[PDB]
Design a binder for this molecule. Sequence first.
Ligand SMILES: Cn1cnc(COC(=O)N[C@H]2CCc3c2cn(C)c3C(=O)Nc2ccc(F)c(Cl)c2)n1
Ligand SMILES: Cn1cnc(COC(=O)N[C@H]2CCc3c2cn(C)c3C(=O)Nc2ccc(F)c(Cl)c2)n1
Lengths: 138, 137
Amino acid sequence: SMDIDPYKEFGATVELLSFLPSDFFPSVRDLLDTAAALYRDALESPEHCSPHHTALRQAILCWGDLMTLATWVGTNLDLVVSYVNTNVGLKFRQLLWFHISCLTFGRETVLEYLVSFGVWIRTPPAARPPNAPILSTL
Amino acid sequence: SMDIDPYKEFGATVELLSFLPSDFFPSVRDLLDTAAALYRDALESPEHCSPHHTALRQAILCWGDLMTLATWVGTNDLVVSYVNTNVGLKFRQLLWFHISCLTFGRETVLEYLVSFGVWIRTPPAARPPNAPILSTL
Ligand SMILES: Cn1cnc(COC(=O)N[C@H]2CCc3c2cn(C)c3C(=O)Nc2ccc(F)c(Cl)c2)n1
Ligand SMILES: Cn1cnc(COC(=O)N[C@H]2CCc3c2cn(C)c3C(=O)Nc2ccc(F)c(Cl)c2)n1
């Protein structure tokens, strides 16, 4: 009945993030470790902090639930715990990455970088500079 | 790992919502139909609107993913049963909390949470016949 874009309120879209190839995204394991190492005080906080903070909280907690289900399938039975890493994995990797990068580097900067990298990675190797464009706050 | 309370930033807690019995919560089916019927324009909006709006969006989309997984398991009995038992309650709590916070007002939904839990726990013979009422006035 409804069609909601997790990214739309943050000035992007599901299509735009599917621009970046699936192998550009860190692991889930590494993305949660990074949110923890950088933002645990703020994520666990009893303040909104920012809309990015709100969204990321739910994303982390949701990944929890999806994994609790996958674990519960394993302790009540292989191809199921495989499906998550294939399809939902990319989804949360995109979403965790977007929000962490938006808090670290700045939303506006992460949006430029999204197109920057997608254009470059799509340029064939022999014609493109040897290194990607760089994501930074300075 | 980390320990995050979806409700904490909204002035409540996971414990507090587990106060209300599981059969007090509308269905998921009915909760999404209600968010749609009341908030579709705002939820689909490209504006934050409110922190409640942000959280609810993610909750709805997440329930989507959890069900897509359960459907994909079925098209590949007790698995699609587990979701309605354990995660179902979780999303019913969370969808209800956020919709009720947008409709009636956060502060009002927090009072009502304790109000109802105290009353439902009072034995029948001693408690008024009707629950306390959740409303805007
Ligand atoms: C020559 N120069 C000038 N300034 C800088 C600093 O910039 C980088 O090296 N950027 C690295 C660091 C993080 C990063 C980099 C490149 N990309 C594509 C990323 C990235 O966004 N990774 C990332 C982002 C968010 C995350 F949560 C995790 Cl786990 C990883 N170099
Ligand atoms: C002066 N006065 C007398 N009556 C009223 C209106 O109040 C109720 O009838 N309350 C009912 C209607 C909705 C409701 C009621 C009691 N509870 C616990 C709820 C409720 O929270 N329902 C609800 C809330 C959010 C939802 F998303 C859905 Cl699907 C349902 N005002």
